[PDB]
Design a protein around this ligand. Structure first.
Ligand code: SAI
Length: 246
């Protein structure tokens, strides 16, 4: 008979001012006008302009939620530990900010870690905070403009940063990360998780659902090997999900 199923439906959502959308396709037509890098009008530009004045401090990268740091880092460490045949040579910290993840996790697990961050005062502070540590290159670029060499990384970290990518560029970037992995490499993707999206009109970003992410992974040609919610996460915050992708 008629029955609930345990598909490519439109994903609706809204922004933080309360404008609503029937689909993501409708939203990107609204949000991706003009020069994307215009600081006042541009999807990307507005986000970069927002970050220009964020303090280069842990409080700054954690949106004033400093106290979630320890649990976040322990969850990632336990998750990465569990990945079968994960390599331990080279890592890349994408949207690195001041190098928090590199400083507290990657430098303990990888022989060399590179950093990718488009905001100059964030990247500069990372250089200072990471002085005398197993760090390689400091790449001043956005994810969507970065060129990564093939067959290089055993881990590619994308945490609290893919919210700034358009879906088109999310798809492109994850496929580009895939070719940058070694055979024992994984993308480590850690992000806030909504089945509707929320455009944040303050920092020009969006939070997507698990189904939305997976739609994008499928389009990228990238597969989920492992996934898990961050345990012991404050109940009032968006859930934080980790994905290991190959
Ligand atoms: N398009 C983009 N590509 C790469 N990084 C970006 C982009 N837009 C914003 N960012 C950066 O993303 C960072 C988000 Se704050 C999170 C920082 C770090 N991943 C951590 O968890 O500690 C900021 O440093 C900001 O400058």
């Amino acid at each position: 008979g008629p029955g609930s199923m345990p598909r490519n439906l439109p994903i609706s959502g809204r922004d933080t001012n309360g404008k609503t959308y029937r689909s993501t396709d409708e939203m990107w037509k609204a949000e991706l006008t003009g020069d994307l890098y215009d600081p006042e009008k541009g999807w990307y530009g507005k986000a970069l302009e927002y970050w220009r004045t964020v303090p280069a401090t842990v409080s700054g990268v954690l949106g004033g939620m400093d106290h979630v740091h320890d649990v976040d880092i322990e969850g990632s460490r336990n998750f990465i530990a569990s990945l079968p045949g994960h390599g331990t040579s080279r890592a890349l910290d994408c949207g690195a900010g001041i190098g928090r993840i590199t400083k507290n996790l990657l430098t303990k697990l990888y022989a060399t870690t590179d950093l990718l961050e488009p905001v100059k005062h964030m990247l500069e502070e990372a250089k200072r905070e990471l002085a005398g540590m197993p760090v390689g290159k400091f790449i001043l670029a956005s994810m969507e403009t970065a060129t990564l060499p093939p067959n290089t990384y055993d881990l590619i970290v994308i945490q609290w940063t893919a919210i700034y990518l358009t879906d088109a560029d999310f798809v492109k970037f994850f496929k580009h990360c895939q070719q940058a992995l070694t055979p024992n490499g994984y993308i480590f993707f850690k992000e806030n998780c909504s089945d509707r999206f929320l455009v944040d009109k303050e920092d020009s970003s969006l939070t997507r659902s698990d189904i939305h992410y997976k739609r994008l992974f499928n389009e990228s040609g990238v597969r989920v090997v492992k996934e898990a919610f961050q345990e012991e996460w404050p109940t009032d915050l968006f859930p934080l999900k980790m994905y290991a992708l190959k």
